[PDB]
């Protein structure tokens, strides 16, 4: 009724909406996020849009911290995958919850935006895959399926 692969496909759709609407709120603009094509309005698109709004205030308070640490991290095309996986693993080491799932979407957004601002174009799909595959391989996609799929993320907050 809700396989891990189904959640993975939904995650890509949720994340694209998350990226577009989160960037639209915060707006130098990232044209890759301004022009990111999205599927027709759907429940999955609605989740990503709602998850973007609920972080509007909080994200600004954390900008200075994440942006300073990403500058110190100096993520690149060669090390982005390793760094994402280690950071995401530590985040979920003590358990899975909706806040950490949303935080993972947010880190993917921040990581993709940071590398673009430093010249790494055409990498947004790579970061999307990082997010999707990490969830799939680290039991997060299954966790969402156990909660009924991404529809359970609707109206959080």
């Amino acid at each position: 009724s809700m396989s891990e692969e189904q959640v993975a496909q939904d995650t890509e759709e949720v994340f694209r909406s998350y990226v577009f609407y989160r960037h639209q709120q915060e707006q130098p603009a990232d044209p890759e996020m301004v022009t990111l094509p999205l599927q027709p309005s759907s429940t999955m698109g609605q989740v990503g849009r709602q998850l973007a709004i609920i972080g509007d205030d909080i994200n600004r308070r954390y900008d200075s911290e994440f942006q300073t640490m990403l500058q110190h991290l100096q993520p690149t095309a060669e090390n982005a995958y390793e760094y994402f996986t280690k950071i995401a693993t530590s985040l979920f080491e003590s358990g899975i919850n909706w806040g950490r799932v949303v935080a993972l979407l947010g880190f993917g957004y921040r990581l993709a935006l940071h590398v673009y601002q430093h010249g790494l174009t055409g990498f947004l799909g790579q970061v999307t895959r990082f997010v999707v595959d990490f969830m799939l391989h680290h039991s997060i996609a299954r966790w969402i399926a156990q909660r009924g799929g991404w529809v359970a993320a609707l109206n959080l907050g």
Binding site: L73, K86, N97, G99, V102
Partner: peptide, 22 residues
């Protein structure tokens, strides 16, 4: 760590999000 400190910030972010979710 830098990587662990980033994961720490993400847990703290997740904590504030969870508070709003409940």
């Amino acid at each position: 760590s830098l990587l662990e400190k980033l994961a720490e910030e993400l847990r703290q972010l997740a904590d504030e999000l969870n508070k709003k979710f409940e």
